[PDB]
């Protein structure tokens, strides 16, 4: 029976994939040697944020969409739901900071050698975490544990205008601004790399860098697009409750989890230079 026993199977599959990816990335980043670096610290923060997002969003939402009631306590309804948005905002801001650091390191390879310090990287990570906390604050009271038709549920028990305003604010602060920043930064970087101003190796390297940049840009643009699109359709359209709508919601959740599941893949274990870290951990 489709959409009956395959949903938890896919949930467990993507959970395992994300967990093994995050662990394989963190084992090379933390263990092996030379763990202090701006790029290394940024990739480590990104991996930790993605791992926490997966661990806090996949099992709970899977249990919600599998069981008919909330089988957790009262504190597990307002805490992990906040952790989810905290980690997603942290990951978005970390990707933005990574793109900005790439632009700074490519545009000014020499004139940006005094500003690229581990102290500045730690300061940027702290600012990212502070902004994510400030944006995820209201999620402590956004979701609340209530009761519906004789079953204990954990639902966003807020007023309609306040909930709509919070959804609009988090859509503007978690999707619009980071997508714009990534787009502008990648456009400027690719225009600087392909400037008019030898050998086939340099051209192959430029093509590979351009392909990777386009891939990560399209990934970040298309992973969180259907979720916000469905949110806007709920808040501004009809949104009928049918089987096709449930399938679309499940697919949106799957493609949103795929972002954190494949981010460690295209960022860390895509180059032959990073995988050499497997020769020192064994």
């Amino acid at each position: 029976h489709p959409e009956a026993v395959i949903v938890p199977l896919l949930f467990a599959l993507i959970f395992l994939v994300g967990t093994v990816g995050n662990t394989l990335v963190l084992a090379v980043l933390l263990r092996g040697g030379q763990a202090v670096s701006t790029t290394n610290l940024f990739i480590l923060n990104l991996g930790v944020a993605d791992l926490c997002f997966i661990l806090c969003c996949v099992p709970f939402q899977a249990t919600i969409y599998t069981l008919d009631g909330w089988v957790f306590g009262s504190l597990l309804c307002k805490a992990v739901h906040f952790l989810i948005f905290l980690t997603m905002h942290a990951s978005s801001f970390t990707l933005a900071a990574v793109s900005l650091d790439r632009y700074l390191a490519i545009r000014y390879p020499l004139h940006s050698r005094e500003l690229r310090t581990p102290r500045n990287a730690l300061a940027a990570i702290g600012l990212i975490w502070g902004l994510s906390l400030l944006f995820s604050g209201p999620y402590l009271s956004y979701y609340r544990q209530s009761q519906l038709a004789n079953l204990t549920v954990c639902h966003p028990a807020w007023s309609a205008p306040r909930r709509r305003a919070m959804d609009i604010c988090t859509f503007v602060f978690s999707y619009l601004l980071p997508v714009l920043v990534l787009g502008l930064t990648y456009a400027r970087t690719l225009r600087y790399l392909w400037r008019a101003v030898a050998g086939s190796g340099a051209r192959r390297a430029k093509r590979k860098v351009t392909r990777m940049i386009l891939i990560v840009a399209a990934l970040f643009c298309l992973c969180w697009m259907p979720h916000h699109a469905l949110i806007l359709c709920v808040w501004f359209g009809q949104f009928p409750l049918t089987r096709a709508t449930y399938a679309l919601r499940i697919l949106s959740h799957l493609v949103s989890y795929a972002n954190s599941c494949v981010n460690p893949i295209v960022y860390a274990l895509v180059s032959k230079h990073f995988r050499k870290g497997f020769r020192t951990i064994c």
């Binding site: 959409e3 009956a4 919600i64 969409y65 069981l67 008919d68 009631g69 909330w70 209530s146 519906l148 038709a149 079953l151 549920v153 954990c154 639902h155 966003p156 028990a157 807020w158 309609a160 909930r163 709920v234 409750l241 049918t242 089987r243 709508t245 449930y246 919601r249």
Partner: peptide
């Protein structure tokens, strides 16, 4: 196959 635990979680109260 919508359930009271999913439709209520998505649309609210």
């Amino acid at each position: 196959g919508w359930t009271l635990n999913s439709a209520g979680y998505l649309l609210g109260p």
